[PDB]
Write an enzyme that holds these catalytic residues in place. Sequence first.
Site, PDB file in Angstrom:
ATOM      1  N   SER A   1      24.190  67.329  31.880  1.00 16.14           N
ATOM      2  CA  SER A   1      25.462  67.896  32.399  1.00 16.14           C
ATOM      3  C   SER A   1      26.202  66.956  33.268  1.00 16.14           C
ATOM      4  O   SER A   1      27.318  67.154  33.778  1.00 16.14           O
ATOM      5  CB  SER A   1      25.119  69.015  33.229  1.00 16.14           C
TER       6      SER A   1
ATOM      7  N   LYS B   1      29.726  66.192  32.479  1.00 21.61           N
ATOM      8  CA  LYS B   1      30.881  67.109  32.997  1.00 21.61           C
ATOM      9  C   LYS B   1      31.927  66.604  33.803  1.00 21.61           C
ATOM     10  O   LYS B   1      33.180  66.898  33.932  1.00 21.61           O
ATOM     11  CB  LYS B   1      30.235  68.540  33.621  1.00 21.61           C
TER      12      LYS B   1
END
Length: 261
Positions: free
Chosen positions: A43, A46
């Site tokens: 992640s 992101k």
Amino acid sequence: SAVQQKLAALEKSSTGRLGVALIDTADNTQVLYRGDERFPMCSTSKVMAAAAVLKQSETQKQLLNQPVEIKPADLVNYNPIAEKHVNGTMTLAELSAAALQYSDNTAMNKLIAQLGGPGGVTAFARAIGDETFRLDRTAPTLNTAIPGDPRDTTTPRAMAQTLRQLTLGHALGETQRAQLVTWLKGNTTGAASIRAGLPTSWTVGDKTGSGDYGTTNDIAVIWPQGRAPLVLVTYFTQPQQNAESRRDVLASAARIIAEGL
Ligand SMILES: *C(=O)[C@@H](NC(=O)/C(=N\OC(C)(C)C(=O)O)c1csc(N)n1)[C@@H]1N=C(C(=O)O)C(=C)CS1
């Protein structure tokens, strides 16, 4: 260096593969450990998607205020914010905050879609001179972190340089850069990661990630007192598919850096 030796010792003790890149903007020195090896971003990618949307907003003036519909087919594995708006809307600013500050994977998919797919996120990386980052999949599968798989990877050196350019440098316009930094400083998911290895009086913006293979990641901009900002990337992945997350290992990497440099 003594820091590199301690990172090597940390990696060996923890039973995994550790990637670290520190940039000290006081003198532009870099400390790398496996700095040119590829790691799954998870992640942490992101940040690139949110930054690319901010870049779009420099020429589409109030793009961040545009409502985006959240549909049932949008929900994935972890959607703590988007699930409260299914069959409703969230703005691109709200999706960016949800993606960055809660690691909402549905929010990330809306950002990726807004950029024309994973290739659009990668195209933004290339536009700011990052030739290493690659985003190949959407959420959730971008987090599989299978060893040997080059998809959805970057290197610590490349990611530290990019995070510096986005937050401290000139990759974004002034308003957009400030917004990115505000979002990262407000992250809710990082208390056990790089922040746990730093003094509490230092200011931190960060974005975590985790995936299979016990992959535990964090990338951070740090504003200490008494010295210029630092950029720190810590990536860690382990041999077993169901290994437990080791946020404490990232905290220890940050402590080594914060005490040794
Ligand atoms: C980012 O890294 C995201 N990670 C995931 O969606 C996946 N796993 O997260 C963990 C916490 C490891 C899990 O066991 O579910 C994932 C997708 S596909 C696959 N095989 N694993 C989100 N970001 C993090 C973070 O570290 O910031 C979370 C804690 C929530 S998910």
